[model samples]
Target: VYLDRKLLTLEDKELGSGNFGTVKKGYYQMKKVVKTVAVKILPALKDELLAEANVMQQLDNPYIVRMIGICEAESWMLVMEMAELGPLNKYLQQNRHVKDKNIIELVHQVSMGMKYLEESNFVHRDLAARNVLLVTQHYAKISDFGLSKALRADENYYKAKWPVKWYAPECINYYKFSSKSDVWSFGVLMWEAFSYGQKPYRGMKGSEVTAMLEKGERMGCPAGCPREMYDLMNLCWTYDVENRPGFAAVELRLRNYYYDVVNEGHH
Candidate 1:
């Protein structure tokens, strides 16, 4: 009954939106590569669109969004690795709190992805929960490419994208982005992992949040956040860019979280 149809009937749900277009949750299938894939159809195009494709080709980490293949038409069709459950936000909202070990594992996978990008000299300017999807109880994958820039041979290079609240202070105020900026975002992502996925700003408009940030303002987790997560999130938003830790440091901490919470403590 589903054969002649050729395309598997994928349920349509809004995952998230970006400069390129709205990303929808769907599944696709083919004989050679028989597995469900997330289909992202971009809204616009520029030379940078091709750049995203190039970056995806070189990014081999499982945590980073996988670009399985692409089909370009009047609009762009990008067939990518699909997260069976959905974005981390939904999972977090449903459970209200993912276990500490699970959160640590999620961060571990992300760190591995970040390490891959850094080793290859690529910077994922956009890295957060919305751009990440959960694969299992303790695993996640990064998504979104409309804003990523491939860092080739320069330290002072960056590509401009949306001003997400999780960004580093320098990236926000001075337009400086690097793998280090990604580290800042990773810190915020840890909060999402701890909280089960609440974004910064509590649903406020981007301009409202940015305006406050530009004026030397700072924010933290809303009331009811666990102190551990609250402190960790705050560390990520440090105003001194150089003081912020890198992915390796953060990953080690998260790994320690799993050991401390799951191994050392009662089951």
Candidate 2:
């Protein structure tokens, strides 16, 4: 449904804030009933933000948050479906007692979302636990498309800004962006899932991160992380961008793990 300025009301509850602006808990009138929604207000009007708005409008997937509509009268705003549990990292941290099966389900959900983006030829420059929102304790959905871009065959790389700790070797040195680079970031997201919100490359400075990566140093498996799970992370972190598997491959690997856990429970 299209959202107009008059039908939306912002609440005192601020959902989250970032460099872009703030996401607040809001309500939109739907016919006779008022529905809860999350309103993302952009800091300033910019072409890039408008481009991202277009990208959000076109995306529709079960594992990705739905874009309700946009309000562009006095302020640049995006209306989106609210996730009750907030970001994935925060959800995991708050519910530290979460089961292994549920955690695997979270990972699998994100992989599926990224796989869909890959098939659609879109690159999510930022893919991390914090960017994922939880609909419930057991269900998660990907969000945040401020840095997403449509991929072209000749466009293997783009000099776009990205998070340093999540950067693949190729991206750090050459400012390149690709689906494989996103795969590298996904590996970091896996670490966050297992580590319970621990920062990637913790205790190391940003400058040190690149040097450490240059020496083939990847984040070690978080305590209690499964070997097979870490192996999939390693595959995503492969130094040579060409050597790293695509999101589709990573999704299949996670799918296998999901089934492995399911079958074991039966036994």
Name every residue pair that clashes in candidate 1.
Answer: none
lDDT of 2 at 33: 90
TM-scores of all predicted structures: 0.80, 0.94
lDDT for 238 (candidate 1): 65
Whose lDDT is greatest here? 2
lDDT of 1 at 139: 70
- What are the clash counts of all predictions, listed in order? 0, 0
TM-score of 1: 0.80
Give lDDT tens digits, candidate 2, residues 8-127. Answer: 999876889643668999899888998889888863455665777788888888999888888786678888888989998888888888877788889999999989988877888888
> Model 2: which ten-residue window has the lowest total lDDT?
42-51
**Weakest ten-residue segment in model 1 by summed lDDT:** 1-10
For residues 180-211, what per-residue lDDT tens digits would candidate 1 score against the true structure? 78887877777676666776667788678778
Off by over 4 Å in 2: 31-33
